[PDB]
Amino acid sequence: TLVKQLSSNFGAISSVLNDILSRLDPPEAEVQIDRLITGRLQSLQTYVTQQLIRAAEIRASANLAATKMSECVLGQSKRVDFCGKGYHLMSFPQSAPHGVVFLHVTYVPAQEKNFTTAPAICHDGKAHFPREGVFVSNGTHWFVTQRNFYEPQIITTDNTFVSGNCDVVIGIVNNTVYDPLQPELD
Amino acid sequence: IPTNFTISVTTEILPVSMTKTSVDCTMYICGDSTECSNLLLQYGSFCTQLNRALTGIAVEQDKNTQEVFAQVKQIYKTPPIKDFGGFNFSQILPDPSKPSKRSFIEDLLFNKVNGLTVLPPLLTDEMIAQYTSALLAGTITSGWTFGAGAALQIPFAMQMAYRFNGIGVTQNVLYENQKLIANQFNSAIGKIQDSLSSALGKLQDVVNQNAQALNTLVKQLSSNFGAISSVLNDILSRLDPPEAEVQIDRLITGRLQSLQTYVTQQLIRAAEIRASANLAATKMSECVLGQSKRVDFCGKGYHLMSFPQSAPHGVVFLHVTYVPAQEKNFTTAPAICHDGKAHFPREGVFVSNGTHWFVTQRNFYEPQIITTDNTFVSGNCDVVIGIVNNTVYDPLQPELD
Amino acid sequence: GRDIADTTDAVRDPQTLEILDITPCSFGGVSVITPGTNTSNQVAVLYQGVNCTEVPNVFQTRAGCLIGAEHVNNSYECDIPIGAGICASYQQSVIAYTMSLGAENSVAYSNNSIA
Ligand SMILES: *[C@@H]1O[C@H](CO)[C@@H](O[C@@H]2O[C@H](CO)[C@@H](O)[C@H](O)[C@H]2NC(C)=O)[C@H](O)[C@H]1NC(C)=O
Ligand SMILES: *[C@@H]1O[C@H](CO)[C@@H](O[C@@H]2O[C@H](CO)[C@@H](O)[C@H](O)[C@H]2NC(C)=O)[C@H](O)[C@H]1NC(C)=O
Ligand SMILES: *[C@@H]1O[C@H](CO)[C@@H](O[C@@H]2O[C@H](CO)[C@@H](O)[C@H](O)[C@H]2NC(C)=O)[C@H](O)[C@H]1NC(C)=O
Ligand SMILES: *[C@@H]1O[C@H](CO)[C@@H](O)[C@H](O)[C@H]1NC(C)=O
Ligand SMILES: *[C@@H]1O[C@H](CO)[C@@H](O)[C@H](O)[C@H]1NC(C)=O
Ligand SMILES: *[C@@H]1O[C@H](CO)[C@@H](O)[C@H](O)[C@H]1NC(C)=O
Ligand SMILES: *[C@@H]1O[C@H](CO)[C@@H](O)[C@H](O)[C@H]1NC(C)=O
Ligand SMILES: *[C@@H]1O[C@H](CO)[C@@H](O)[C@H](O)[C@H]1NC(C)=O
Ligand SMILES: *[C@@H]1O[C@H](CO)[C@@H](O)[C@H](O)[C@H]1NC(C)=O
Ligand SMILES: *[C@@H]1O[C@H](CO)[C@@H](O)[C@H](O)[C@H]1NC(C)=O
Ligand SMILES: *[C@@H]1O[C@H](CO)[C@@H](O)[C@H](O)[C@H]1NC(C)=O
Ligand SMILES: *[C@@H]1O[C@H](CO)[C@@H](O)[C@H](O)[C@H]1NC(C)=O
Ligand SMILES: *[C@@H]1O[C@H](CO)[C@@H](O)[C@H](O)[C@H]1NC(C)=O
Ligand SMILES: *[C@@H]1O[C@H](CO)[C@@H](O)[C@H](O)[C@H]1NC(C)=O
């Protein structure tokens, strides 16, 4: 567009300086030269302004790309939906013409299942809470498993901690907690 | 050490998009005259260039809205039974009685705020309300699991226990204070409801700026710019073409300058609107679909969860945070010296009430007896600066004896 | 007479002395909705902001008058955006519909169950 704007009159009699010079005397010629100069100056200024406005957006995109290089490639990020979709594991950069490509590796769970759950287990007038995980039941028995993957385990005093009585907690369920020290003692 | 807590709910308002306007370059400068159009055809591609800039600005607003509000794969519905453990979500959940499914707070928010053409948005207000309702129902029913894949159900109290764990407080603190926490949340939501009906200035500023720019553009059509008159029909009726051209040229120059100034300032405004929309999309991803550890990003305090509500040309976030209260003085030590060896706390701090020594968690006062189960040994008592003398209990010995 | 922008909104007739309001004639843009050139050579035309009567299947939207597309009362995912919740697709002729936000799902929430 900038190059093509060089064939416009902008009100003058011609778009060629040499034709204006040949077909007119100097005092009248300068009047047309001024019109051409004004038009071409306006075209240049428009080009420069739009170039600045575009460079600002390019800078913002480059800043985002630099932050992503710092936080997805040189570390593991906990920011949600910043480094791919899912639970971020690691990223690999690639170089593209005037750009960069990030390959994000994430962890997606699958194949979920129904379970029954309780907040605490009441045993011997004491309330037990899971140290790290959740209480689940398959219908007849109770286990404790980690939250993001199903691996049931027997409820003992090594998976739980005691805090208070059974009267306060809403939804406490009766069950048994196995003490590993007693069988070895006896 | 704090001995009590407070539940705080606060609001944040972010503009997302603005009005989509278009101007025909030829109609503004000339109107319906052929002579002016023929004279204007000698200036190049200014009119084509100005129309394309405005078209790009208009197209960007739909992307702005889509990036913020379309973040759920499916439209989740809340269950008919509202058994959420004592927590009450009614001013933020939709009501079918209103013809639009906007919630109460959304209704309060919506009640407050020549070649010219205004274009309608691609998404209507009902669709945006449906997006917000789907996000909020997903958050209530499945926690943060629907952000990273399929929605997995969980009771709300257990989700709040997970969120208390996420800020360094144990689960029994939540489970032994559930009614008080529910009451505090309900009171805070009610306070927001009262404060809104009795704010949204950032959304009105954009409307005022756009309207004022359009008014200036329209009013600049009554300037002579050196011609005998500002009305083109009078010039064409009173003068012959050779004498009319010298005035029409001045009118064309002035009107071109006016349109170019308007378009440039419109582009500069659109850039800022885009930056604000990007920030809003980041907040939607990180505060509503997860729990953020960044300080002062989602509210003021320790972030628990956030709820989005749609506003006219904007979005409102309600941030729920944890604020400790009612602190108390204690005396502390780095380690304990017992049997010539130094003990350190596993996940707590040693405190003293003046006569006895206990171990407690850092964000809540809950003293306990110092045993070998909650401490670990490293070295001897000579190296540490500030170690104190005390006894450490061994649970196995009394049971064995 | 003059408006806020100082234009001749109203005039008085000289011969009979009556006041006649002056309102501009209709104008607007013209947009063409097309599939690929390989796919077909038929198009739909949208007159933006123009009532359908003023135009010299006809379907009226909030964006304007749509000519050449039949309205179907089903909902699909958006293909070509028209505006105000209306999209267009080629399914053979061009059809216009109301876009759907997505599939509807109800989570099996309970105070006892976990997944
Ligand atoms: C819940 O899990 C428990 C533990 O695996 C199941 O109990 C076992 O069931 C198998 C199946 O016949 C028996 O061979 C084992 O002897 C059982 N173990 C014990 C300790 O009794 C139980 O059947 C599961 N419940 C359901 C409904 O599937
Ligand atoms: C922690 O703070 C809460 C809220 O201030 C206290 O609960 C209130 O306590 C007062 C004083 O007994 C009662 O009159 C109120 O009815 C309680 N509830 C509310 C909603 O105000 C709570 O007692 C504090 N905890 C401790 C240990 O003092
Ligand atoms: C500091 O904590 C100790 C331990 O709880 C307090 O000592 C107890 O005081 C109560 C009466 O106030 C007695 O019934 C307990 O038997 C005491 N416990 C022991 C182990 O002796 C003590 O009062 C607290 N305050 C101060 C100032 O020492
Ligand atoms: C959990 O049980 C509900 C009961 O209707 C069922 O619809 C849902 O699919 C189950 N979740 C699974 C199988 O992951
Ligand atoms: C679930 O709700 C039922 C019905 O109100 C109630 O009987 C039961 O105790 C509740 N369980 C929990 C864990 O809240
Ligand atoms: C648990 O056991 C206690 C006594 O052992 C009893 O009072 C209580 O009702 C039991 N809980 C349930 C849910 O049956
Ligand atoms: C929630 O609060 C409203 C008052 O704002 C009340 O009318 C409603 O009954 C409450 N919800 C429940 C389940 O009681
Ligand atoms: C703690 O000690 C400081 C300094 O003596 C005193 O100002 C303050 O009132 C005391 N109590 C609390 C709760 O900070
Ligand atoms: C704290 O500083 C005082 C000096 O005022 C000193 O006597 C004391 O030993 C210091 N505390 C410890 C644990 O060293
Ligand atoms: C702590 O006990 C040891 C061993 O009895 C003793 O040598 C040391 O002086 C005691 N510390 C203080 C501050 O008295
Ligand atoms: C002439 O104009 C006057 C207005 O001054 C009007 O009252 C009258 O009817 C007109 N006569 C004719 C014949 O048009
Ligand atoms: C037009 O569509 C056909 C689909 O059958 C495709 O094969 C063809 O490549 C398309 N045209 C061009 C130029 O790609
Ligand atoms: C078109 O004109 C009819 C007749 O007055 C009117 O009912 C209709 O509302 C108009 N169209 C629009 C979009 O307003
Ligand atoms: C539009 O809805 C009406 C409802 O009566 C129905 O009869 C009509 O078939 C629908 N349109 C199409 C194209 O099916």
Author numbering:
A (entry chain C): 961 to 1146
B (entry chain A): 714 to 826, 856 to 940, 944 to 1146
C (entry chain C): 566 to 621, 641 to 675, 690 to 713
Sentences from the paper on this structure:
The SARS-CoV-2 spike glycoprotein is the major surface antigen of the virus. Its function is to bind the host receptor ACE2 and mediate the subsequent membrane fusion required for cell entry. Here we have examined the structures and receptor-binding properties of spikes of the B.1.1.7 variant first described in Kent, United Kingdom (now termed Alpha)10,16–19 and the B.1.351 variant first described in South Africa (now termed Beta). Recently emerging variants of SARS-CoV-2 have acquired other substitutions in the spike including a number located at the monomer-monomer interfaces, at the receptor-binding site, and near the furin-cleavage site.
Similarly, we also show that the Y453F substitution in the RBD of mink spike, a structure of which we also report here, only increases affinity for human ACE2 if residue 614 is a glycine but not if it is an aspartic acid.
